[PDB]
Subunit: 70 residues, 3 copies
């Protein structure tokens, strides 16, 4: 009876140890995931560069038209 | 006495089962997040592009000046 | 024998509580991380940028020749 009850507790304890170790592995995975704030900062840079290129494209198109008349 | 300890283990049985399911869910949530390595790959390319845009800016300003008005 | 069984249950009781808290903590941490769908969108924007840069370099080289 007490031997049977301690068998169940031991089975549960074994599961918990396994789960503890798995969660430690997952904690490490999470540390290696990219933060939203960092992605946003890179996105802002890309958008800054895309706007610079946009205005450059317009100017080059303008200049191309002007020189094509001369 | 033993009945009350069984009732405690019955409670813990359920908690361990729920924990197993929560950890499975956490593992799925983790898989939907991007790795830092993926972000750094993009960052490396943006670094290349930053220099190219700088050079383009200088070249286009030089050309705008040369061309002048109509 | 009865004290040993009670201590085994105490061990389980404590570890379950501790692991519940840790899993909840990690759940919260996850919410601050970037989704793969969003990184893929950024990857496509970076593609957009690199293509436009190459195209513009070529346009500028041609214009530069024409002006010079």
């Amino acid at each position: 009876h007490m031997k049977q009850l301690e068998d169940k507790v031991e089975e549960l304890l074994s599961k918990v140890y396994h789960l503890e170790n798995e969660v430690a592995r997952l904690k490490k995975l999470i540390e290696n995931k990219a933060d939203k704030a960092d992605m946003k900062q890179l996105e802002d840079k890309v958008e800054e560069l895309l706007s610079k290129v946009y205005h450059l494209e317009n100017e080059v198109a303008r200049l191309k038209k002007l020189v094509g008349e001369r």
